[PDB]
Amino acid sequence: RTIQQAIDGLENPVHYVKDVSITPSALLAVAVEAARLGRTVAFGPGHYTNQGQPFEVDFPLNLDVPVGTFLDFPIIIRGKTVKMVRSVTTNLTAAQCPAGTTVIAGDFSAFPVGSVVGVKLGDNTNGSASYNNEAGWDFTTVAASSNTSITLSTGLRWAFDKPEVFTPEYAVRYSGQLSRSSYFIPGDYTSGLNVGDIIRVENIDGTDGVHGNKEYFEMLKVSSIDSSGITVETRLRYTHVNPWIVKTGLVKGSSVTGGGRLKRLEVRGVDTPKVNSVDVDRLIVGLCYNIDVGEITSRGVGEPSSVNFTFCFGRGFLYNVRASGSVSTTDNSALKLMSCPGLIINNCSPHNSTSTGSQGDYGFYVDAYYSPYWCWNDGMSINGIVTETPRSAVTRALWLFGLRGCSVSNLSGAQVFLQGCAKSVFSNIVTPDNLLELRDLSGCIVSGMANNALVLGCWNSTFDLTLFGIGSGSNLNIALRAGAGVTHPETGVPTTLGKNNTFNVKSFSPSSLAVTLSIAQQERPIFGAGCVDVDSANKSVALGSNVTVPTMLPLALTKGIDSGSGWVGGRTKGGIWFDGNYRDAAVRWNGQYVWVADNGSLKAAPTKPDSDSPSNGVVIGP
Amino acid sequence: VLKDGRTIQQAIDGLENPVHYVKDVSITPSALLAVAVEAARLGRTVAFGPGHYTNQGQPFEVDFPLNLDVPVGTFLDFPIIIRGKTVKMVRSVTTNLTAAQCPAGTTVIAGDFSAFPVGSVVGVKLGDNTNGSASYNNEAGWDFTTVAASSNTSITLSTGLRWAFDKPEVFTPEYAVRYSGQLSRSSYFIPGDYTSGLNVGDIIRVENIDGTDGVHGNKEYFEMLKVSSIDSSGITVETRLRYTHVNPWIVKTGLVKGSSVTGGGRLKRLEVRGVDTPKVNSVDVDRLIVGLCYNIDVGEITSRGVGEPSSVNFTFCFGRGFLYNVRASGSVSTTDNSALKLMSCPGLIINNCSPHNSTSTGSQGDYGFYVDAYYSPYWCWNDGMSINGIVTETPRSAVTRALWLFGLRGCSVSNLSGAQVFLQGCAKSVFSNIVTPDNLLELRDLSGCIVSGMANNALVLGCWNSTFDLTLFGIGSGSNLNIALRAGAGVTHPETGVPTTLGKNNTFNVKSFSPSSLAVTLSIAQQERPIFGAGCVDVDSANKSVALGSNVTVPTMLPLALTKGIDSGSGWVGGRTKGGIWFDGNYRDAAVRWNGQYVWVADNGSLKAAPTKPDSDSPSNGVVIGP
Amino acid sequence: VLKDGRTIQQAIDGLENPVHYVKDVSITPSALLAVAVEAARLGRTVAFGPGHYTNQGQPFEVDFPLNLDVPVGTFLDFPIIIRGKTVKMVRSVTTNLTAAQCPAGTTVIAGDFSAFPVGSVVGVKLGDNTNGSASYNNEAGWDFTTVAASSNTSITLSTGLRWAFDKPEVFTPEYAVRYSGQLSRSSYFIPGDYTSGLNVGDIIRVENIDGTDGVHGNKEYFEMLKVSSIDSSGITVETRLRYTHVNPWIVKTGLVKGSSVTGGGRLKRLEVRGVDTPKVNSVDVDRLIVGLCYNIDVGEITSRGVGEPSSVNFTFCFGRGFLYNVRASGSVSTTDNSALKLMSCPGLIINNCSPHNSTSTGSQGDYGFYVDAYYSPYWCWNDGMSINGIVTETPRSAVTRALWLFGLRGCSVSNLSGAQVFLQGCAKSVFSNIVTPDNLLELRDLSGCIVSGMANNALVLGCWNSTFDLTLFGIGSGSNLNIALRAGAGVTHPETGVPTTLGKNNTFNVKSFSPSSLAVTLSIAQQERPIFGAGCVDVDSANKSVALGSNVTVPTMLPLALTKGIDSGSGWVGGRTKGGIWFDGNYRDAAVRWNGQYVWVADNGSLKAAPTKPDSDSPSNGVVIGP
């Protein structure tokens, strides 16, 4: 009967998964068939648990997950970080494969002498920050191989746990410098690369990492190629010296949308992933290009992060994200980004982060160190981050580290830490109940309002702050404290004195204990014309150890200011116009009030004159 | 008949009419309700075919999740109301009484209350059939107390009603407990044993009684919170408290678990009330109301209005919400209201709203955008909002005010443009990138705020510890006639509620570029220690640069670039500095003008003075003050 | 084999081939049009199954609403053009005349115009087969006049054509009336009786003739407005007028009522022209053009380009639009153009645009982001836009300028980063959070603007009543060699159009941190009353702090933190203050450096001077000025 066949077909659309009991292998076959067409797999209502197994694909996945569908199992889309011809896994420990290792045991017969070989951490280890390698890739050449060992031509830069050793499909050493902001890489790569391929550029000898470190890399998409060189779709973010150029195998697109719920989604190694309008309890996006992720909610799964983004390159968008429910024992964050240059971030609202010991679990954290790598967060635009204090002994809530050339605005709710940033603007910071902590910023502009503030180090920076209170702990009774730095963020030079920082502080604490500004370990601090405090305070300017060339413009501080011969005042052409008579052009100067009288003479008196000729007045001249 | 026993007719009928798809514009209200009930059983969407649906003219109301897909070509032309339980109740009695029959302080209410046990918790709300009245301070209030007596003809409350109630509805909460002590703002753990009534995922109402953390120090305010863990020692909530409460009631709500409306089509009227995590996105809604919800997500909305005082409202939305890409218009009011109106939505991120075509009939206004903290009786702070990107136009009204923000604290606000802004009664907030060059900028009773941008002219009333960094292009035409920036008296400190008429410690950095020969750059009255900063500029066509009115004390000035008259007096305070100043020049460019002299250090090191600006180091009208 | 009328095969065939689902990539252009016409009757979507559709290589053009659902896996690889009527017409005559044959001032046009009555309104547009030419100032112009003579061989216009036209098309509008007098910007009511030609919901074109409210005071500008109410006394419009018009034409348009393209898939080329409220969202569009639309909503778009001078552009969009989350790339030009290009879009909110990979072949540029107000002949202001979040990179071109904003007024702009910004010919706008530390920041002919952020170095040309608050890290390498901030001559005031070479009353607060021994912090010429504010800073490695060039008058300085040479002269003006100053110290830290002396008040109250900074209160080189 054709009618029965027709109705059976109508009741069971291809590409519509509606049986929660679909086997893992049948679900995989659905996804394989959809990918041949490039179309979506859609789901009917229900609670799907996939026999408790992860569902992993290495090809494009386009899911429509509607309201009423819960995909309650791990879904992992995983492309190839480096495209490989062969690989040998290993169970050596980091102690058996320490930094500088050149000989690795295993069956390496098929690895030709002189070929390029790469080494990565095994897929069943997280490595360790203790030997500075949780995410590292190393490239070198084969000096010798046998069915018992391989000899590398240069030693491994870091220790590896469970090293996996492989031959890249296409990997070439560049001789010379690829400068940041370039778009053309000279050379003949036509034997290995095509338009649309994504390459990894792995620095070896350059120093354009955070703190001047040499471990960093970036991904780029080839937009043109000929025998003279390749052009890439976005300009280089970092300067590389003698890098490796390596072909990746990122998956060509993937998407997850629809309004339903996913327990755990991992999107790794994808070119142009989209994740939008879903509830994802745990979301991980890593080693991707041109991401677009937004309108996401995430309740967490009790892991140290709930949503994180790692090594995302190109021009990404991250918007309208509510993330929560993370629990950590070491530093981590509900919403966490690590080295995502060029990303636009708009409107993130994290909350309910918890730490169970002595370290933090932040609401929002942008970090540039993922051992071994120190890739700058170059050129990010961040607007609209609303936080609350972690449920933690650590009250820090929002932490930005390793940003350069970034525009940052509208940060509110809980304690902000800005650390190790360069040439960036941070405005509309609104955290009136909290400390604002600032460390080792170079050429930054910081403005907004807080309870109290701490500046450690910093160079050529401006701090334009309204402060409502004073410190309670290491900054006890001080509205703004400045102290020693540690490291210049771009050069990595150890540096304890801050230099040339401008302070425009309006301090409104009504406490009789308040010390408006307490400054130490600073060269040429500048106290600007915008400084204000009120006369209930205890002290206006306390200068401590190692302050040199302190500089002041006329301001509206009301209580004690420390003295000394090193003060530099304002400088001007044109004089000044003291526009007044004895009433309102009397200049207070040491123990006198000095004024020009109505008859043109210069006078002085030890108390403010109530006439042009007070009885305690004297004529200076003529 | 088919292999599974069904006839062909049933199989095609089901394919041509899926249970969750509504394509018949003539579907009855009862049949539509049955569709919605069945979709809620499966947690899934009801989708519509094209057509103009009127539901026999009837409102369509549900008290369970509704998830609608309303595509382009579908017009749901009937009210749709999703209504959860603001407080979960085990019994309730409605009355017919007016507010005059149930005044403030009432303890005895007529009706059949025989099932209300003495000593149980009893609540009173306005009936759903009244809006109350701001005239007795109660449009939205809830009161909780205990039963002191009950019978089949009246009930006696242990404490008198806080406000009068119209049509009071008297009820037993399913779970309500009185807390003894303070719950501080920014806490996340509430001590006590709530395990007999609460579970993880429940939403609770915390109703303040004795605390003063409302706007103006008022005692009427509340918030909602979601329970994230519970044990016999206390509950934790998934967002920290926004307000400090003292001896509050802790009350279990019955918010609906989710709901959504999406799809590209058009709805005449959508009310989303008492929903945990509602989503409304990518629809045209003529009248949208979202009220008493948690963790909202509303965006990509257009609204043409229905000629009512507001077109789009958000009221009492708690947790962490998003509101974005909204175009609203078409409202008509007789008393103050707004096309897009928000009342007490702490923690909300608002991005890109573009209201227009708002109209008022009388002497009050119909604003484009209004964030308000007073919804009588409540004064819940708009604490911790982030607002970016609001474009307004002048209402069609006697009142030119277009964008009004009241009762914000700890808020980051930026990018407000197009028509007249009023900031009122805000604290510890930043308002930047204000761009309203054709309009007055009005600022009243701000405490610890920073306000920057550009306008035609400006008015500062009161304010404490605030900074006004403004470029102004014109001068006032009415109550601020010919003044670029006027400062005058305040009314009330916003946090403490203390009546206060003098502003204090405000910084003014005003660049005033009106070319009018009538312009007065700054006209300052009723201010203690106003500070005229180094950023002040005007131009020498002005009539006057600084006029000082009544009750100005300790006026303070830093060296600046104002060019016309400045009022004199012995109370002026100048800038203070270490290091002296370097007057870097000789007689031509280090001559200091001082009263009627020019004073300079001559090339031989002597100090000279002359009554006109010196054209040489030794003018014939020069005098040596000394060597 | 029957159901209730229909055969079972009918029903099965209907279900296997639903009528609004296009799933056959072989569908003919005629059949696809018929699907679109049927959907428009219902106002519903056309949805596509997966596949690569090429429409037999034909453009697909409609002049009625189109609502497409284009899902992931669908590629519509052919041009799709939705085109409403810019002006509704009742007759039109096309010609093949060249611009030399129809020069500016032309009153007589050959052709069969026997159907055009003397005294009726006639309009002239460029033919649809021409682009015109900027060389005779007309790529987009419309002219309206009356018929003075007509016959089967020519028409005579009552007034000469304002510009030359190539292939002029001559037509009678359906409804066009001349307004006598001024329609002021910001108004909403247009007096007169238009009921014979207009209804609520119509969109009108207001074409200025005699007003001067264009950029540079030019007379060529127009806007579109939607009628929200009408009676016999006048019309009301949904949004207030953006421009002031004098003796304009009021012309009825035929904009299409709605259209939309969504769904996740890919389109080769989409042109949306003459549409009331188009929506384009969540699609990949290689080339996207949106022009002459009202209340646009375009967002979540990616565009890889087609190698044309622009990839995505918006022209003449009115009302209240949104543009958001756009990644555009792949443009290639030989004359100025931009990957993402906007021309005259007043009132538009723009949020989060990330253009890249733009290329130009010769001496002009191909920018990443460009907002322009000149599209010949028109100079319509970009009035009241809000722009936030633009990330650029340097074009692959000899021109390094990457982001160019021209002809903005009343705009709030923030968060511009990544590559070289040019702000030109803007008025009464704020531009903040500019972060381009590797690049020149170029600023020309700004009036009443506030510009803040950080760059490598900066150039200010002209400008009036503006503020430049900048941190600079380097110095120029070419035209601005060795200078951190250079100021020079302007050209034109942007609002009045008055030719003006001197800037006036600009405030410079520059913090310059170049460590180069060549650095000149400020090099100022062609400026009246430049103000060097109290926020200026440099470091003492620099060569020079302030170099004054030709035509600097009334240079004004407040006490600041510049450390190297400042040019001298008698025209310097210092700060002004009430209350004196408190030099709070003794000989150590209240010594005033003054010409070649240090002056201080000694502990005994006498005034002293010494030629070196004093190391005691009575140095051996000191002198008592007086007691």
XYZ file of N, CA, C and O in Angstrom, chain A residues 477-541:
260
model
N 40.891 53.246 56.207
C 40.591 54.667 56.410
C 41.041 55.564 55.273
O 40.986 56.768 55.402
N 41.472 54.996 54.143
C 41.965 55.746 52.989
C 40.951 55.682 51.839
O 40.365 54.599 51.559
N 40.679 56.849 51.213
C 39.784 56.823 50.065
C 40.497 56.299 48.822
O 40.041 55.332 48.220
N 41.606 56.914 48.409
C 42.445 56.366 47.327
C 43.852 56.159 47.870
O 44.519 57.111 48.305
N 44.330 54.925 47.798
C 45.726 54.641 48.143
C 46.475 54.313 46.875
O 45.926 53.641 45.998
N 47.701 54.809 46.762
C 48.576 54.338 45.686
C 49.826 53.754 46.312
O 50.359 54.294 47.288
N 50.307 52.672 45.694
C 51.494 51.984 46.170
C 52.259 51.346 45.022
O 52.156 51.769 43.861
N 53.111 50.392 45.388
C 54.080 49.830 44.435
C 53.432 48.941 43.388
O 52.477 48.191 43.674
N 54.068 48.926 42.213
C 53.704 48.037 41.132
C 54.593 46.790 41.175
O 55.374 46.575 42.103
N 54.411 45.939 40.162
C 55.212 44.721 40.036
C 55.920 44.647 38.685
O 57.145 44.499 38.622
N 55.166 44.758 37.589
C 55.694 44.510 36.245
C 55.056 45.451 35.217
O 53.825 45.592 35.261
N 55.851 46.054 34.290
C 55.237 46.738 33.091
C 54.564 45.680 32.255
O 55.183 44.664 31.948
N 53.328 45.911 31.817
C 52.563 44.830 31.191
C 53.034 44.472 29.784
O 52.859 43.309 29.389
N 53.565 45.424 29.021
C 53.990 45.124 27.652
C 55.436 44.651 27.616
O 55.748 43.642 26.968
N 56.301 45.361 28.321
C 57.723 45.005 28.284
C 58.077 43.898 29.259
O 59.123 43.254 29.084
N 57.285 43.656 30.291
C 57.631 42.719 31.323
C 58.770 43.158 32.238
O 59.208 42.364 33.067
N 59.241 44.392 32.130
C 60.318 44.811 33.038
C 59.790 44.927 34.468
O 58.784 45.624 34.709
N 60.438 44.310 35.446
C 60.026 44.462 36.848
C 60.176 45.913 37.257
O 61.229 46.515 37.063
N 59.098 46.480 37.804
C 59.045 47.918 38.043
C 58.169 48.149 39.251
O 56.989 47.772 39.209
N 58.721 48.753 40.310
C 57.870 48.962 41.483
C 57.320 50.380 41.571
O 56.299 50.556 42.217
N 57.981 51.378 41.004
C 57.475 52.747 41.121
C 56.486 52.987 39.992
O 56.809 52.754 38.817
N 55.311 53.510 40.333
C 54.432 54.069 39.299
C 54.993 55.393 38.799
O 55.893 55.979 39.417
N 54.524 55.869 37.643
C 55.105 57.087 37.092
C 54.087 57.875 36.272
O 53.402 57.293 35.447
N 54.069 59.188 36.457
C 53.280 60.126 35.640
C 51.785 59.830 35.690
O 51.093 60.105 34.711
N 51.259 59.374 36.824
C 49.831 59.064 36.905
C 49.114 60.319 37.360
O 49.599 61.013 38.253
N 47.938 60.564 36.786
C 47.090 61.679 37.156
C 45.955 61.189 38.012
O 45.310 60.191 37.668
N 45.711 61.892 39.123
C 44.667 61.533 40.092
C 43.694 62.706 40.155
O 44.073 63.793 40.572
N 42.449 62.517 39.723
C 41.388 63.505 39.951
C 40.354 62.810 40.810
O 39.495 62.110 40.270
N 40.461 62.974 42.124
C 39.659 62.229 43.091
C 38.728 63.183 43.828
O 39.190 64.142 44.456
N 37.428 62.878 43.805
C 36.437 63.594 44.607
C 36.002 62.612 45.671
O 35.398 61.580 45.348
N 36.357 62.896 46.918
C 36.207 61.954 48.020
C 35.172 62.524 48.967
O 35.435 63.530 49.621
N 34.036 61.839 49.091
C 32.929 62.403 49.876
C 32.645 61.660 51.168
O 31.641 61.976 51.837
N 33.514 60.771 51.586
C 33.323 60.149 52.894
C 33.134 61.227 53.953
O 33.948 62.156 54.046
N 32.152 61.076 54.829
C 31.986 62.016 55.937
C 32.691 61.541 57.199
O 32.530 62.173 58.236
N 33.484 60.471 57.110
C 34.136 59.926 58.292
C 35.204 60.869 58.801
O 36.027 61.373 58.030
N 35.246 61.039 60.135
C 36.353 61.793 60.719
C 37.684 61.070 60.638
O 38.711 61.663 60.979
N 37.682 59.811 60.220
C 38.910 59.040 60.036
C 39.481 59.167 58.635
O 40.602 58.681 58.405
N 38.746 59.764 57.689
C 39.109 59.628 56.274
C 40.456 60.291 55.938
O 40.727 61.444 56.284
N 41.269 59.578 55.163
C 42.482 60.100 54.536
C 42.219 60.080 53.036
O 42.159 59.003 52.434
N 42.092 61.248 52.394
C 41.649 61.292 50.995
C 42.606 60.567 50.048
O 42.185 59.728 49.241
N 43.873 60.917 50.101
C 44.850 60.327 49.208
C 46.044 59.905 50.049
O 46.578 60.737 50.793
N 46.474 58.644 49.936
C 47.675 58.170 50.615
C 48.560 57.570 49.534
O 48.201 56.556 48.957
N 49.693 58.213 49.253
C 50.493 57.959 48.050
C 51.897 57.560 48.453
O 52.574 58.284 49.185
N 52.359 56.426 47.913
C 53.729 55.956 48.133
C 54.157 55.232 46.858
O 53.332 54.770 46.057
N 55.473 55.146 46.672
C 56.069 54.378 45.551
C 55.582 54.904 44.189
O 55.154 54.139 43.302
N 55.638 56.217 44.021
C 55.142 56.880 42.809
C 56.099 58.010 42.446
O 56.411 58.875 43.271
N 56.513 58.026 41.192
C 57.281 59.121 40.577
C 56.332 60.050 39.826
O 55.535 59.582 39.009
N 56.434 61.339 40.075
C 55.584 62.334 39.425
C 54.103 61.940 39.432
O 53.440 62.002 38.390
N 53.526 61.665 40.602
C 52.052 61.647 40.694
C 51.560 63.075 40.499
O 52.166 64.019 41.015
N 50.463 63.229 39.756
C 49.882 64.553 39.456
C 48.513 64.666 40.101
O 47.618 63.867 39.804
N 48.333 65.628 41.007
C 47.031 65.805 41.690
C 46.336 66.923 40.939
O 46.752 68.075 41.027
N 45.274 66.557 40.201
C 44.664 67.437 39.228
C 43.640 68.378 39.820
O 43.234 68.257 40.990
N 43.215 69.299 38.961
C 42.297 70.350 39.368
C 40.931 69.817 39.718
O 40.109 70.586 40.233
N 40.671 68.558 39.444
C 39.401 67.984 39.807
C 39.346 67.361 41.185
O 38.318 66.755 41.528
N 40.380 67.474 42.016
C 40.329 66.846 43.330
C 39.485 67.633 44.320
O 39.577 68.857 44.387
N 38.646 66.913 45.079
C 37.740 67.545 46.056
C 37.699 66.641 47.285
O 37.634 65.416 47.136
N 37.702 67.217 48.488
C 37.192 66.479 49.632
C 36.448 67.456 50.538
O 36.183 68.617 50.151
N 36.040 66.937 51.706
C 35.230 67.754 52.603
C 35.942 67.864 53.942
O 36.771 66.997 54.317
N 35.591 68.944 54.696
C 36.438 69.316 55.828
C 36.173 68.533 57.084
O 36.836 68.816 58.099
N 35.334 67.493 57.039
C 35.295 66.528 58.139
C 36.458 65.539 58.115
O 36.645 64.796 59.097
N 37.212 65.485 57.015
C 38.217 64.434 56.869
C 39.389 64.643 57.815
O 39.582 65.709 58.439
N 40.149 63.577 57.966
C 41.300 63.621 58.860
C 42.532 64.252 58.199
O 43.334 64.910 58.882
N 42.721 63.991 56.909
C 43.934 64.311 56.159
C 43.590 64.325 54.679
O 42.813 63.462 54.244
N 44.194 65.220 53.902
C 43.906 65.263 52.458
C 44.956 64.535 51.651
O 44.597 63.735 50.791
N 46.235 64.825 51.857
C 47.273 64.151 51.058
C 48.363 63.676 52.007
O 49.070 64.499 52.597
